[PDB]
């Protein structure tokens, strides 16, 4: 009887959302449906384009039901407030959405409450202004959850999906595979933060006050995460956006998606995570996440930059190009904060910078660099990361690089933190080495035969080549 | 330095309405003055305009219904950061 999706997000050990308010920007809703009655407030903010009643509130009623519905909702408690920015045909405007986001912020300023989650179950093309408005609202301290989009395409080409600081959610089905329906399906790529159930999701039907219907979409998926986030914020009202994101990632089911469903170049960029509620089991823990930059593009002096959130520390920095035409990467300071920068080679199509960004309070971190010598540098403190860059066209708390390369060590003073290094090598397109259960991968690199790059996937260090050796630095309290 | 942007998916564009985004610290009073100035400069050129909304609280700026002919003029207004043509969003 438990809907498959609600079972899917239930942790392996288990026992909400009322201190939290969830805003919904959508079609009109049937607020008298028994799933949501008395739990959703209709603001009557409305900004929708002209067309070109049961059907009118179908989309919105279902999602309000996914988030907070008493029988089939994720966060059965939760309070919701609804804004109408989609018309009866489900169409809205960027300007209308902006006006809506502004309305939420004015409400907050006029009558402050607790943590806010804003669900944006909608998409248009890439919009500079819409992305900026989302970012600005995130920086004001509001959590935004958005749909990845339903076009079986790169989510970075859509808004608010591509919008920095917003949690972007793709949809997976009952077999934990990405939803695909012909030429349509879940979006994917590096702008997607995680996936959640978004096929065959039962919820409130606006046909009648007690009816139910199954719907599919990245909106349904985003609604699961809004519910999950609302529960997480009730339990821990002080979470920063970076902390909430690290928890959503940490508690997801990992490596459950068959990545063959995604286009080849998007596999590496797309996180293999299906959202789930935190367990009853939760003492301090080291949380890290992998942040891929935008591709640098092909200019000769091109650089890709991957950054961490203000409250995170950059513990390592790696890079990757599909061609292998790469000048490596370096950790460089910037506004008093370290970023991961990767360098394209002359004739390269471009490269990615790949940061490992971690929540490490009490950390004092620095970088130690040595110019081309092989080349070596050490933390003379724990080593959390090695990087290397070169300027040539071709070839023990210690990092070792190629003789023609500069080498950079990320060194932190973090008492109460233990780190070890685990190595693995073979004759090979991909070599792999994982931290032990309960350890957090902080750094991933290849021993210095021609590598495309290296990256952490959860707690597994992956090295890609064309005698290769993967090296993982793993830490815990 | 002010730039123009419109949706790359041509069918999703909504020409004739523009979001005028002003520089970050621009004050509401200035946003309003800038909108009126646009309306005046347009009117002297024979163009009707309508200010649909003035933005403040996240981004400063305004929403304006006008011919795209006026975009060169509008990009030269004081405080302008960029202008974006309105476009469609959809239930997912």
């Amino acid at each position: 009887s438990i809907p498959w999706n609600l079972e899917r997000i239930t942790p392996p050990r288990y026992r909400g959302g009322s201190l939290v308010e969830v805003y919904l920007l959508d079609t009109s809703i049937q607020s008298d449906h028994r799933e949501i009655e008395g739990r959703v407030m209709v603001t009557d903010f409305e900004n929708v384009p002209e067309e070109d009643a049961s059907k009118c509130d179908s989309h919105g009623t279902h999602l309000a039901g996914v988030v907070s519905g008493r029988d089939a909702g994720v966060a059965k408690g939760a309070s919701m407030r609804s804004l109408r920015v989609l018309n009866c045909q489900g169409k809205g405007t960027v300007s209308g959405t902006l006006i809506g986001l502004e309305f939420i912020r004015k409400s907050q300023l006029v009558q402050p409450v607790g943590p806010l989650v804003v669900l944006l179950p909608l998409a248009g093309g890439y919009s500079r202004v819409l992305n900026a408005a989302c970012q600005r609202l995130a920086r004001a301290g509001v959590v935004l959850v958005t749909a990845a989009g339903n076009f079986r395409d790169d989510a970075c080409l859509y808004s608010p999906a591509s919008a920095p600081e917003v949690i972007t959610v793709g949809a997976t089905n009952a077999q934990d595979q990405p939803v695909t329906l012909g030429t349509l399906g879940t979006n994917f790529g590096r702008c997607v933060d995680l996936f959640a159930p978004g096929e065959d999701i039962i919820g409130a039907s606006s046909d009648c006050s007690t009816c139910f219907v199954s719907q599919s979409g990245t909106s349904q998926a985003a609604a699961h995460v809004a519910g999950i986030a609302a529960m997480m914020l009730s339990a821990e009202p002080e979470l920063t956006l970076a902390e909430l994101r690290q928890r959503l990632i940490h508690f997801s089911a990992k490596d459950v998606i068959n990545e063959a469903w995604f286009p080849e170049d998007q596999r590496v960029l797309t996180p293999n995570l299906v959202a789930a509620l935190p367990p009853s089991t939760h003492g301090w823990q080291l949380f890290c996440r992998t942040v891929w930059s935008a591709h640098s593009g092909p200019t000769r002096m091109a650089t890709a930059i991957a950054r961490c959130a203000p409250d995170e520390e950059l513990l390592s920095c790696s890079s990757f190009s599909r061609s292998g035409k790469r000048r490596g990467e370096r950790m460089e300071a910037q506004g008093g904060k370290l970023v991961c920068r990767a360098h394209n080679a002359f004739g390269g199509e471009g490269v990615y910078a790949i940061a490992r960004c971690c929540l490490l309070p009490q950390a004092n971190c620095s970088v130690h660099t040595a110019p081309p010598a092989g080349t070596r540098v050490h933390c003379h403190h724990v080593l959390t990361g090695c990087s290397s860059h070169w300027e040539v066209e071709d070839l023990p708390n210690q990092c070792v690089g190629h003789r023609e390369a500069s080498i950079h060590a990320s060194c932190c003073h973090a008492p109460g933190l233990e780190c070890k290094v685990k190595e693995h090598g073979i004759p090979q397109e991909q070599v792999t080495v994982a931290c032990e259960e309960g350890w957090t991968l902080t750094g991933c690199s290849a021993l210095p035969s021609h590598v495309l790059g290296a990256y952490a996937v959860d707690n597994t260090c992956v090295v890609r080549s064309r005698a290769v050796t993967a090296v993982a630095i793993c830490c815990r309290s | 330095t002010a730039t123009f942007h419109r949706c790359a998916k041509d069918p999703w564009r909504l020409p004739g309405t523009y979001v005028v985004v002003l520089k970050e610290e621009t004050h509401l009073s200035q946003s309003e003055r800038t909108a009126r100035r646009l309306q005046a400069q347009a009117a002297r050129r024979g163009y009707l305009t309508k200010i649909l909304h003035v933005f403040h609280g996240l981004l400063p700026g305004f929403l304006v219904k006008m011919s795209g002919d006026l975009l060169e003029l509008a990009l030269k207004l004081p405080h302008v950061d960029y202008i974006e043509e309105d476009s469609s969003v959809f239930a997912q």
Binding site: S58, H59, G90, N150, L184, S214, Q215, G217 | A91, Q92
Partner: peptide
Amino acid sequence: XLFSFAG
């Protein structure tokens, strides 16, 4: 691609 993938 609105309403369960235009389904």
